[PDB]
Design an enzyme around this catalytic site. Structure first.
Site, short mmCIF file in Angstrom:
data_model
loop_
_atom_site.label_atom_id
_atom_site.label_comp_id
_atom_site.label_asym_id
_atom_site.label_seq_id
_atom_site.Cartn_x
_atom_site.Cartn_y
_atom_site.Cartn_z
CG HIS A 85 -0.36 0.56 2.50
ND1 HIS A 85 -0.23 -0.33 3.50
CD2 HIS A 85 -0.12 1.76 2.78
CE1 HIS A 85 -0.02 0.34 4.50
NE2 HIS A 85 0.02 1.79 4.17
CD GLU B 106 21.67 11.81 6.77
OE1 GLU B 106 22.97 11.81 6.83
OE2 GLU B 106 21.07 12.59 7.42
CD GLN C 255 18.74 18.13 13.85
OE1 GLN C 255 18.12 18.83 14.63
NE2 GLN C 255 19.71 17.42 14.58
CB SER D 113 2.47 1.98 6.37
OG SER D 113 1.40 2.29 7.08
N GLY D 114 4.80 -0.04 6.15
CA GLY D 114 5.95 -0.85 5.31
C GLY D 114 7.22 -1.13 6.32
CG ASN E 79 16.68 14.60 13.04
OD1 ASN E 79 15.69 15.27 12.32
ND2 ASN E 79 16.74 15.16 14.41
N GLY F 64 2.47 6.47 8.59
CA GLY F 64 3.82 6.77 8.43
C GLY F 64 4.91 5.63 8.90
CD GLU G 277 17.34 10.35 7.80
OE1 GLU G 277 18.40 10.92 8.32
OE2 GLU G 277 17.11 11.09 6.66
CG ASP H 246 0.01 -3.75 2.90
OD1 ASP H 246 0.76 -3.31 1.87
OD2 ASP H 246 -0.42 -2.95 3.70
CA CA Z 1 19.02 13.00 8.61
#
Ligand code: CA
Ligand code: CL
Length: 240
Positions: A45, A69, A64, A188-189, A61, A186, A59, A93
């Site tokens: 979804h 990353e 910031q 989800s996944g 934050n 948010g 990741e 799903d």
């Molecule tokens: Ca960051």
């Protein structure tokens, strides 16, 4: 995540942020689990919309520069063939994303370990959900990755009338439901990490919460059961 705590920077290095292009920026929309250096496991979804997506590994934050990353575009999307967007209760799903580049592994970036095929956790097995989802029902996304301790609720209990009834399937994992802590939009996944034989494995892909609220007593967060899809995952990666 509602009722979570801030995760230490290197606790969940397989957690990724799945983001879509919005104007001249990128916006987090869902979590995911890095399962190969160029493959991510997420919820089907999350990629129903025909958007430009990128994955961020390393990741912590969203607002910031963490100094860790790696940003990688989604090159190909393989959604489970039985997924139906208007029937999330049917399950399926789950989707795999092939990345344009193979990310570099380090203490902030590692592959998620999957459970053995067919594994089912005993009721009340300890797990953590992680994610940048809303911190309150109808709230806002977290800036820093959150974790919440959510014990599993087995099928017999989860599919009972006071819980999720017929909505939950044996192809799903339920966890939490205490009315305080839960996944939320948010998340989800993303992963549900559960300690088995001293090692965490990613047993769930966050799929849905109640329409009445994220943290609702006897409405545990519901996840796609990763151990029901091991063959599917292996088959997709081998043919792509
Ligand atoms: Ca960051
Ligand atoms: Cl991890």
């Amino acid at each position: 995540v509602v009722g979570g705590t801030e995760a230490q920077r290197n606790s969940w290095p397989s957690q990724i942020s799945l983001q879509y292009r919005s104007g001249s920026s990128w916006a987090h929309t869902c979590g995911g689990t890095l399962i190969r250096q160029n493959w991510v496991m997420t919820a089907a979804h999350c990629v129903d919309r025909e958007l430009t997506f990128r994955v961020v590994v390393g990741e912590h934050n969203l607002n910031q520069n963490d100094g860790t990353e790696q940003y990688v575009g989604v090159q190909k999307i393989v959604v489970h063939p039985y997924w139906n967007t208007d029937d999330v209760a049917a399950g399926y799903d789950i989707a795999l994303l092939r990345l344009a580049q193979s990310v570099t592994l380090n203490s902030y970036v590692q592959l998620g370990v999957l459970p053995r095929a067919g594994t089912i956790l005993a009721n009340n097995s300890p797990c953590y959900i992680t994610g940048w989802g809303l911190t309150r029902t109808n709230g806002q996304l977290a800036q820093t990755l959150q974790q919440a301790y959510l014990p599993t609720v087995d099928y017999a209990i989860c599919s009972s009338s006071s819980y999720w009834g017929s909505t939950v399937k044996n192809s799903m994992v339920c966890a939490g439901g205490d009315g305080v802590r839960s996944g939320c939009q948010g998340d989800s996944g993303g992963p549900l990490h559960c300690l088995v034989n001293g090692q965490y494995a990613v047993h769930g892909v966050t799929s849905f919460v109640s329409r009445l609220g994220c943290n609702v007593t006897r409405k545990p967060t519901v996840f796609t059961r990763v151990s029901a899809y091991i063959s599917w995952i292996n088959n997709v990666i081998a043919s792509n």
